[PDB]
DNA sequence: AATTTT
């Protein structure tokens, strides 16, 4: 497996150095490139040859950053007063257990049931947490439940997929099973042929139940047992005040950094059987610093 | 982050100087470029490379203008103004709307970035929206009657105006992100990605679009969710066809006069964001 | 402000010279370019860059000639009872004098919200003939694509009149027509140049059937009828024409508008406060004595 | 209108020389170039620019040799009772002389609004064969593509004839069909461009069933029918043809039209004073002695 | 006609030499080129110009080899009783001599209007195997794509034969199908291009049900019955084939056709006077003495 | 068959060497290229010409590798106990003889099994049907998946692929013709996107469905017209015994153990079935299974 | 872009 000779001219070396500079500075989107450095962007976008290099460098940097180290490294790079822990205790759940669950889920280590399902009443802290999580990974994709024919664009290459108000029909019910479970497969692209998506973490929030397939309008639960084998649920019960705002990067970063000095002793025992619904908190709250 | 050493050819510096000239002279469209400097347009439009450079320079100048200062700086007799007389005839107080729009176009008045027009047909509703959109650097137009492909061509524009549409069910949730002003990703029906970061929106429509229609029966539980941050404006009895189209200089003078007025009335109005003024 | 200090290669100066030559000789179409100077057209068409230069130069010349310079002047560069257009107008029992004044005031955008002009009637009534005769007199005119579904209003930007012929208001593009027909500026996609910000142009529509009934996929609705009616001017053609009238040339339009230009601008001013849907019928004591 | 003083490179001179050679050797299609000069085709097809030059040169040669020359001159150049077309026309109970005169006058756009010929009848009767034989003598002919409802009327610009073989008018493209069949200048969109300004082209249509009825989804409408019959002339082909007839040749139609041109024109004018939808049948009284 | 004197550079000469080499070695497809000379193919595929040259050279070589030459010469080049095709035809109750003679006549567009050969029967009877056996002997063969509904007749220009495997005619492509199976020169539509001139090619169709019944929506119509019947010759296959017969190679086709051609033809033109929709059966009293 | 005497340049020679490198190092895909030789990928991806050369070299390497040698050589290639193989245990649990299945899939991957060109796995959910199919599909040099909702283009992905996979296969009425043509396994031509048609010389197909597929759906109803014809070109397996959430995504390296063993033993039990195939795979024989696994 | 796409 010795590398090819290659060598390369000055342009190749300059492009490789630019890719390294982008990767080491945590720049992964065009807007971040514009904010961080404007002179380089303006110089590069002055010609067709320069404009072609922008997309190539961006995707190469994204791939190198994603493949070289796991997402946990990115998510890690007052403890009992953060917004996340307050919300989670309000919704009657142990923050530590779900934190361990998400840390395992991002790295594709939750077995077949590698998904986060959010079922609950509307306007009760559902999409806010999902968006806060999704903004911390280098890049995230959004699944299109509609159009019945291109429902999985911009999924390949991304490090996490997000679903809102999910509606699942039989035409996606079993096709999306591998994506929900993180199995490698091939997904088509517009004006292209297949993309070979290798499996990504998936989080879905829905007001209505999704395990029943909408058979046009009758909504027949033919794939009853099929869908529930892929996702684990985390129900939402109570409401919250309308002045919470954006949960930002710092709070979620600290919340995920919390689970770096404790032990997961309950998780491995809970890992023996994957419950369809996450077990609520009963009498195991009040961590020494809570 | 430390800048990267990217010493380029002379063409790069020429493009940089061209972009600087475009941004300094407030030229943000092809028509203004042709009106001001026809020689440069003719010189550049002689080859594909020149056309590409023109397009890239326009986009970069627009972005530099937008992401440098808030848009109000691009805007900053009293009764003789046409807009004053229109709102007086539209039985609405011009002062409250003037103080509201300035905060609404700054992306800082909380999450209250929503304007919308409906009511009597042929009553000066496209005129005001067009005059407002002619004052921002650039505006983006898209309809809402498709209710399946309605957010195409909205990224990169300071303000988005919808001169048509009807609210359907399939896109109830997605608008709740764009109307709210939160970053999201939407389809474009010919391309793939959008990465829209959220921008102020103005929509004008004629028919009943107020209800969040679910097929035929409106499910009003979702209406309040939009309603916390969907302050509405309504028009009234039709206008004479002599006024025509309102220009942009009068808008400048009107907003400049309204800038120095009291800000306490709107702050007191801010406690209760009623859906009708 | 101060013009930018750009320096261009000799090829760019040659391009500018060609643009100036095109503007001075009033050449705004490819066919006219072939008729006048075929040698240079053949010279340019050797390579792809030549074709690109041809298109760019044509568009630039059209814009340079069209800026300022109200369109009516282009129609006034050059007895009257024997005029074919006048005879056709009398055949339909309409005033040949008021129609000319309305055309003059409408092609310069000095009309108001009534930016359109509808030609309605049974087949073989000269609607298309008159529409094309009016169209060919302006520098350049566009047309609405009948079925493209992605660029329905292409060939509109950079023009002077739009002769939407056989017309039907598709429910897919009903709201774009609601904006184009009104004359207010709007932006549309233009085959690579996404968004165009059209300034607005006068419109003429011909049809054998009513176009205010928008087809709703399969059925026909009436919700949009009032809005379209508010900004349209109708004109009813009823009498069948002779089988061998022939095509109306540019000279007939030139003569008719030249005659209508230098007369009393007062009857239109009387019929300027109220813009009724349809033109009034012919009146005995309202025609010029030269027509009597 | 003094032509531009610009002068091109040597490659442009070679392009002009090739265009002149193509125009003066009566080569208008790729097949003629392939079977006349294979070497030049092979040398040009070695790169993209060569193919572009090929296409542009062919189009320019078409324009040079077609402009300001009536089409019938190309059709015009022994016994007459043994001509295949004459026998076929006599079998269908039509006057060959009148049909020949009508075809000669129709191809020159000198028939007013009757710009379309319609061949109607049961299968295996000779409509397609005769239509193709007529269409094979013009400098170049274009065909309307059947099932592409996004660019339904491509391949029409530049061509001197349009053939609609086995055509049915659909409600999606009926406006464009009405515009094209009329025989008036319009603007139709083309690939890699926008609009082409086709100045009217004669059309021939062959069908087994009625086409005035317009299909739409699963229902047939008759609103457009009365607005179409004025643009068409109908010929009824009934008598079945023998299997050994073979394909007609351009020589047969050339001889037939050359003979038909030199005869009397009074009967055709007498019929043409009032054009009718249906072509008059054979009149045994006229019965030119050369065909008795 | 005097050939053009314009010469080319070394690249054009090399391209022409490559075209001649491709023509002389009977390399008419990419697979054969890769199989024979992989080194040159690898050398060429390293740039866009190389791929363009590959496509152009292949097309030009195919045209040069297949022009002004009967197609049957490619079909034509041991006991005949043991040939697999002969045994299959005997098992199907047909005369191999007559079928081979009809195939030879049909392939060189010399079978009148009967320009379509149809195979009909229950599943697993050898229809597709035989159809593809004679499709690998012609230089290049084309396939009609099943589900496109917008470009149903790509890869048909330049091919010497067309195969329709498991084909059913939908109501939206019946006109184009009729035009193609007619076997007359027409013009078709191509992606990224504007119409190619197809001079008519033989078509062979295999199906399990009846294709003369046109499917429209969810129902079946029989309006287009006689027109489709006039252009086809139908063969009936029954009796299930051996489970391990294999794939019929081109050597079997060549041997069978050479033997069929070497004999007489007097028994063929007896039936060729009146072509029938149904192929005549086998009578034990008329077989060639070799097969008795 | 004298080759053309054309002389290449330095760039062409470099491209040929790169193609040889790709063919030798078994890199017949793009992700493997990024994983193994990332720096060269970055050097090549700095221009349009390099981007074109990447695809050209990949296609040429795939063709050169798969042109002559049968795919069974790629599968076999090249030791723990035989009973330790997870696939063997699963097949035994499903009441099937692993030897017969291994021999059949070795013969089927080379198109040596007559008209039978499709493998069908039928069973209730969670019996381990997708895992085995994907494990087999990960051993071939390159595989394709038919499009799920692309009704206009249901077979775009099958173009120069060693195997095609159809998960949750449901056959509609408007796809039956193309589906039958592809499943037949004969040299055909299929339409791509944005371009003309390409040639497919026949590709083995593996399918996985939770319900019957010989019953074809039409609009909203079901018809059995295309029943015998589809059954004429399929071999069916039943996975009735449900499994436990234990098998962690069976890797490709398992099949090398399973197939190499199966090819080792004598074949004088499969040809007794290969003379006359059946629609359904014969069940388990108690007094015939190889004692090395009992 | 046109095709594909609905
Ligand atoms: N645009 C916004 N800006 C700030 N906070 C918001 C916004 N939209 C919603 N929220 C907050 O999010 C919570 C409920 O909204 P949301 O997150 O959408 O709940 P949901 O169940 O996902 N629907 C409340 O705390 C709101 O204050
Ligand atoms: N093309 C035009 N040129 C000049 N003035 C115009 C034009 N169109 C409209 N106006 C004027 O603008 C005012 C209102 O026009 P308009 O913008 O159409 O209102 P509208 O409510 O959006 N039309 P509608 O959609 O029927 O409700 C009136 O004073 C009109 O005279
Ligand atoms: N190609 C033509 N050449 C010459 N004169 C023509 C031609 N087409 C139409 N005419 C003349 O124009 C008259 C009818 O005008 P026309 O262009 O058909 O307008 P129209 O009434 O709108 N027809 P239609 O669009 O079907 O309703 C005919 O009677 C002819 O005298
Ligand atoms: N491929 C062919 N080769 C030779 N002669 C042909 C061919 N096709 C048709 N013919 C002759 O043309 C006669 C029928 O004319 P045809 O071209 O079918 O016109 P048509 O009546 O329009 N047929 P159709 O279009 O099917 O309704 C046949 O009897 C043949 O003599
Ligand atoms: N892929 C294949 N490999 C080997 N032999 C094959 C193959 N396909 C078919 N055969 C042989 O060909 C025989 C029948 O050929 P076949 O192509 O099925 O005829 P067919 O009836 O036209 N097909 P069908 O359309 O399903 O009826 C089979 O019995 C086999 O002997
Ligand atoms: N992503 C995964 N990670 C770990 N184990 C998995 C995964 N996907 C499937 N499995 C295991 O594979 C076995 C069954 O998977 P599978 O092959 O999908 O059965 P199946 O019946 O084919 N499901 P389906 O294809 O949707 O009908 C179980 O033991 C699962 O635990
Ligand atoms: Mg008309
Ligand atoms: Mg026909
Ligand atoms: Mg078959
Ligand atoms: Mg599965």
Numbering used by the authors:
A (entry chain A): 202 to 278, 286 to 498
B (entry chain F): 202 to 277, 286 to 486
C (entry chain E): 202 to 279, 286 to 499
D (entry chain D), E (entry chain C): 202 to 278, 285 to 499
F (entry chain B): 202 to 279, 284 to 499
What does the paper say about this structure?
The main replication protein NS1 plays a critical role in cell cycle arrest, transactivation of viral and host genes, and replication and package of B19V genome. Based on its similarity to other parvoviral replication proteins, such as Rep72 of the adeno-associated virus (AAV), NS1 is predicted to contain one nuclease domain (Nuc, aa 1–176), one oligomerization domain (OD, aa 201–270), one SF3 helicase domain (SF3 HD, aa 271–501), and one zinc-binding domain (ZnD, aa 571–671). The SF3 HD domain of NS1 belongs to the SF3 helicase superfamily, which unwinds DNA with 3′→5′ polarity. Totally, four cryo-electron microscopy (cryo-EM) structures were determined, which revealed the detailed mechanisms for ATP binding and hydrolysis and DNA binding and unwinding by NS1.
To reveal how NS1 unwinds DNA, a DNA with overhangs at both ends, the overhang DNA-2, was designed and included in the cryo-EM sample. Since the dsDNA region is disordered and only the ssDNA portion and AMPPNP are observed, the structure was termed as NS1_2-570/ssDNA/AMPPNP complex hereafter. Instead of dodecamer, NS1_2-570 exists as hexamer in the NS1_2-570/ssDNA/AMPPNP complex. Direct superposition showed that ssDNA binding also leads to large conformational change at the 393–407 region, which folds into a short α-helix in the DNA-free structure and a β-sheet in the DNA-bound structures, respectively. The side chain of Arg438 forms one H-bond interaction with the γ-phosphate of AMPPNP, and the β-phosphate interacts with the side chains of Lys320 and Gln391.
